[PDB]
């Protein structure tokens, strides 16, 4: 069971609606396993750095890239 297989299993563990993408709300549940302003910074942060096409989602490719 490789590192990447675990990145992937992790990714789809948080894809609760099964659309193969991670939206801000999905990420927020990972980021809390704190104030809302702390939470917003982190998420906004992730999306700025990692969401290339700027659609509010990060796909497995974009996820891995981090």
């Amino acid at each position: 069971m490789s590192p990447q297989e675990l990145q992937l299993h992790y990714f789809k563990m948080h894809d609760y609606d099964g659309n193969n993408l991670l939206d801000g709300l999905e990420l927020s549940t990972a980021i809390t396993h704190m104030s809302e302003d702390e939470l917003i910074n982190i998420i906004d942060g992730v999306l700025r750095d990692d969401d290339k096409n700027n659609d509010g989602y990060i796909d497995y490719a974009e996820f891995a890239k981090s």
């Binding site: 609606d17 939206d23 801000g24 939470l39 659609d55 509010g56």
Partner: protein, 227 residues
Amino acid sequence: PHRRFEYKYSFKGPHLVQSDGTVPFWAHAGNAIPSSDQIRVAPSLKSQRGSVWTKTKAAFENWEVEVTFRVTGRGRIGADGLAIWYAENQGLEGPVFGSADLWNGVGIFFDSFDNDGKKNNPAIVIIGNNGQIHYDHQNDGASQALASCQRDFRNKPYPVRAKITYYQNTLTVMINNGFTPDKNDYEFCAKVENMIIPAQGHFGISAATGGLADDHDVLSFLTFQLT
């Protein structure tokens, strides 16, 4: 048009409430009960009112909301209904489907019950307002409606979904009537052309009951920004 999902103006399961009983980014009030797979905005008890509004205003020229919900009761007739809002101020409490009156923006009202006795309910009714109109509870918004359709959103096998789009000054409501599990099976309900609403506003959802009462459950409110 390119759509961006806006988490900060959105909520959904399966981890909807956090442990202090709050919905991230949204304020709830009245009788609303947030569980984790949904918010029961108004449960099937007499004379309930509850609501859920975004904490901050959204400043999107064009947008879409995908709201998924159930309205459920023991009878073939229920009350009062459920409202989806975009409005200049939060309307946490009041007599209009549980939210405030004389609002400035638009409310999309899912009106379960036929107060005007025209046998034309349940119905979906678009109502604009400039901060000076009282919603006419007793006429089901009839003379104030910009547009409307009849659609029985109650007691359906699968959740109902409203897609509400404001693009290029026209407001379209599409409804998936919940007869099937296909979540993209939308049908046209209503449209208002050349409609002008505030450039910034809160998104909201509210519901209420009277002497009759359904549970009004909202599973998710997903907000998208358009271009």
